[PDB]
Design an enzyme around this catalytic site. Structure first.
Site, short mmCIF file in Angstrom:
data_model
loop_
_atom_site.label_atom_id
_atom_site.label_comp_id
_atom_site.label_asym_id
_atom_site.label_seq_id
_atom_site.Cartn_x
_atom_site.Cartn_y
_atom_site.Cartn_z
N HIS A 110 1.05 0.61 -1.00
CA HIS A 110 0.24 -0.56 -1.29
C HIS A 110 0.06 -1.48 -0.08
CE1 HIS A 110 4.24 -2.56 -2.43
NE2 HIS A 110 3.67 -3.52 -1.73
N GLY A 137 7.90 -9.90 1.10
CA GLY A 137 7.93 -9.11 2.31
C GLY A 137 9.03 -8.06 2.35
N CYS A 193 9.30 -5.28 0.41
CA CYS A 193 8.91 -3.92 0.07
C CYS A 193 9.10 -3.01 1.27
CB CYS A 193 7.45 -3.87 -0.41
SG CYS A 193 7.33 -4.56 -2.10
C1 LIG Z 1 6.84 -6.24 -1.87
N1 LIG Z 1 6.87 -6.74 -0.67
C2 LIG Z 1 6.57 -6.94 -3.16
C3 LIG Z 1 7.88 -7.30 -3.88
C4 LIG Z 1 8.50 -8.57 -3.31
S1 LIG Z 1 9.93 -9.07 -4.24
C5 LIG Z 1 9.35 -10.33 -5.31
O1 LIG Z 1 10.37 -7.95 -5.04
O2 LIG Z 1 10.87 -9.64 -3.32
N2 LIG Z 1 5.80 -6.11 -4.08
C6 LIG Z 1 4.83 -6.69 -4.81
O3 LIG Z 1 4.47 -7.85 -4.65
C7 LIG Z 1 4.20 -5.82 -5.88
C8 LIG Z 1 2.97 -5.08 -5.35
C9 LIG Z 1 2.35 -4.12 -6.36
C10 LIG Z 1 1.90 -2.77 -5.91
C11 LIG Z 1 3.13 -2.91 -6.75
N3 LIG Z 1 3.85 -6.62 -7.05
C12 LIG Z 1 4.81 -7.09 -7.86
O4 LIG Z 1 6.00 -6.95 -7.62
C13 LIG Z 1 4.37 -7.85 -9.03
C14 LIG Z 1 3.11 -8.16 -9.49
C15 LIG Z 1 3.27 -8.91 -10.71
C16 LIG Z 1 2.38 -9.50 -11.62
O5 LIG Z 1 1.05 -9.32 -11.34
C17 LIG Z 1 0.09 -9.95 -12.21
C18 LIG Z 1 2.87 -10.20 -12.72
C19 LIG Z 1 4.24 -10.30 -12.93
C20 LIG Z 1 5.15 -9.72 -12.05
C21 LIG Z 1 4.65 -9.03 -10.95
N4 LIG Z 1 5.31 -8.37 -9.90
#
Ligand SMILES: *C(=N)[C@H](CCS(C)(=O)=O)NC(=O)[C@H](CC1CC1)NC(=O)c1cc2c(OC)cccc2[nH]1
Ligand SMILES: *C(=N)[C@H](CCS(C)(=O)=O)NC(=O)[C@H](CC1CC1)NC(=O)c1cc2c(OC)cccc2[nH]1
Lengths: 301, 301
Positions: free
Chosen positions: A41, A143, A145
């Site tokens: 992603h 950040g 991931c």
């Molecule tokens: C990576 N860098 C990141 C996770 C960061 S963390 C919060 O785990 O420290 N990943 C993402 O942001 C993912 C990306 C998507 C391809 C998988 N998204 C999520 O983790 C994500 C999206 C959502 C939504 O979207 C509406 C609602 C609720 C929870 C959620 N989590």
């Protein structure tokens, strides 16, 4: 003596972490030999993320859209491909710090160390269990991931986890290094729920042995139970069944303490039915289930 | 999100671990530039340990009685001296993996990562805190002496602990990297008692701030207190009193939440006087005291 949540030393993995940038998205990658592994992603804009057609998005990218940075040194990307949710960037440089390694898919209940990384830079290490519902209770910020989970055996690193997602409940989801999610999760930007979680019974029993080895024994009793009668009660409390394989892998701790596995099961059944009565075990007010039998043996023998 | 005990990535310290043998005794040493640091009791026979005359024992040793190894690779010793309870061995090779580093003497309440090592080989990394009675609740097996505790601040390792002994109660004692014991312990083979331990108040307050940051704030009240009145009540509950430095390091968390330090003190004081009344904070019935304000800032920002 003593008992702590303990991670593997992280240096072998630290030497493999790099930063991957595509567009305005930056996350971590894993540099082994001449290949960088990272969550696919990274190629998505915030619009794409909602319902990404990954094959199409990747065909539209060139090698030059990927910026890979190892320390202060940019690595040139000379190829790219996709294996499930993992992007593979072939670079023109082999990582001299590549350890011996394997990619493995772990089982629920098993533990591993997580090296949390930001912008390619390791920030912390901690120990996790794969939950029965295929989430992990991690500690991750924006950040993170591409951070990986791993075990180390002799000098071989077994990579088992790459981080992709945080669920609305605050637990975490990710893939093995072949890009297959653990559990029913998808790499799209949606709120996703996990199945109901359960407690890892063989791990709780291992931790009860660790407590005995360290001098906590208020929870022992004179009774034994059958394995079937123990499992009836365990299931009633949302604990996973104990198999005979589990009884066997607890053998060394039973031997060390002189407490038969089914004797310890009668203690656990009394703790489930009665609670802790305001007391603690190894400083915990709850029954802890993220130590495997091998974790305990490694630490207490 | 998520909130865990996290260790620092241990790679920088792994690159500095060696083994030091004298006679049949092998412990761990720390190799920084061309000096190896290790516990001075490596020079003792078991007959010496009850009441060692370290000055006289050392005068009888020469450079060629010390075997220093990185893996199985010998580093030739070319000078030796004693600084308090630490032996310093000058070797003929400067460690090419030496990080930027500092030796620091930490305060009770401060946390650090421990890299548990056996025969110079890193086994595991975990987080612990220095208790107010100058012990640590560590996890160590035979042959762990010389293992070190450390923090990492940008690219600089601050070494703060070298492991020397386990007390009868199962907690651990050691020195800073200048050889000075934390607490009243001595490196001889005697049973030594630690003072009664107390709860680390600055760390509990940091954890309450973490709870507020995460939206768990039922315990906030409409009162404040002076620092002196708080300290007087704190001591009646076996809590450490707060110093001016404690109030200072809570400042960033106070600013982030808008909750003045002494207002949070009044909230804690009410909790101590009244209990939890069957409520939890961050899912726990127990007040956590091994997260410093720095640890909270790191995981909550
Ligand atoms: C990576 N860098 C990141 C996770 C960061 S963390 C919060 O785990 O420290 N990943 C993402 O942001 C993912 C990306 C998507 C391809 C998988 N998204 C999520 O983790 C994500 C999206 C959502 C939504 O979207 C509406 C609602 C609720 C929870 C959620 N989590
Ligand atoms: C070092 N490798 C070792 C600690 C290993 S552990 C148990 O922490 O995993 N150190 C020692 O064994 C020290 C050596 C002394 C110079 C300090 N000794 C002790 O830790 C020690 C001695 C005793 C005695 O002696 C009678 C009684 C009770 C406890 C105790 N601890």
């Amino acid at each position: 003596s003593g008992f702590r949540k303990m991670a593997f030393p992280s240096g072998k993995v630290e030497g493999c972490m790099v930063q991957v940038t595509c567009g305005t998205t930056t996350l971590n990658g894993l540099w082994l030999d001449d290949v960088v592994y990272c969550p696919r992603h990274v190629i998505c804009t915030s619009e794409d993320m909602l319902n990404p057609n990954y094959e199409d998005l990747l065909i539209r990218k060139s090698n030059h859209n990927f910026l890979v940075q190892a320390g202060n040194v940019q690595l040139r990307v000379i190829g790219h491909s996709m294996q499930n949710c993992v992007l593979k960037l072939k670079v023109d440089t082999a990582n001299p710090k590549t350890p011996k390694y394997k990619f493995v898919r772990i089982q629920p209940g098993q533990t591993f160390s997580v090296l949390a990384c930001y912008n390619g830079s390791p920030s912390g290490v901690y120990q996790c269990a794969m939950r029965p519902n295929f989430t992990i209770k991690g500690s991750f910020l924006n950040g993170s991931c591409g951070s990986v989970g791993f075990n180390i055996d002799y000098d071989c690193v077994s990579f088992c986890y790459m981080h992709h997602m945080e669920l609305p409940t605050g637990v975490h989801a990710g893939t093995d290094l072949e890009g297959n999610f653990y559990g029913p999760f998808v790499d799209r930007q949606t709120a996703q729920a996990a199945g109901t979680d359960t407690t890892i019974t063989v791990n709780v029993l291992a931790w009860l042995y660790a407590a005995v080895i360290n001098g906590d024994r208020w929870f022992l009793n004179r009774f034994t139970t059958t394995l079937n009668d123990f499992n009836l009660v365990a299931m009633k409390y949302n604990y996973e069944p104990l198999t005979q394989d589990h009884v066997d892998i607890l053998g060394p701790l039973s031997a060390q303490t002189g407490i038969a596995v089914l004797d310890m099961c009668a203690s656990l059944k009394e703790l489930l039915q009665n609670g802790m009565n305001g007391r603690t075990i190894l400083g915990s007010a709850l029954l802890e289930d993220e130590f495997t039998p091998f974790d305990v043996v490694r630490q207490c023998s």
